[PDB]
Structure 1
């Protein structure tokens, strides 16, 4: 729950995700590098989310909070709380 859960996105999970990109073979070192990329993106989103949460005088983080966090990325298409 709070210790070494980065393996939640597992190697078979990464292989299945790469199946959706249209690839036949996934190399061994692909899994951990895409894990690091996902970690970086998730950290970048959640930093903005938690900073907004602190600004809003709120203790809980809502879905619309991360919606605004991703809003300044610059696309903002459909989704919950759009």
Structure 2
């Protein structure tokens, strides 16, 4: 629906940051696959956090929290 919004030139630019200088196609659609997996996992964690807080605004507190839970502590925004 909008995973295509993460588009092939955009992931090309990501891969320029990655240091590549040749990239085939199917790389692209599966980069969308891995991004889907990452987003849904962390989103589920933050969602569970807020809904246990009986709130309905998943919040950066719960996002940095879900990230630390996933094992990677994004860092700079409180936390």
Q: TM-score, normalised by structure 1?
A: 0.88
Contact 1:53 1:65 in 2 (8 A): yes
What's the counterpart of residue 8 of structure 1? 5
Q: CA deviation at 1:77?
A: 5.2
Unmatched segments (≥5 aa) in structure 2: none
**How many residues get paired?**
79
Q: Which runs of 4+ in 1 moved over 4 A?
A: none
Query: In structure 1, the residue corresponding to 2:18 is in which secondary structure?
Result: coil
Shift in CA distance, 67/23, structure 1 to aligned 2, threshold 3 Å: same
CA deviations over 1:12-66 (Å, ceiling 9, x no partner): 0000000001000111111101100000010000011111111001011111111
RMSD: 1.2
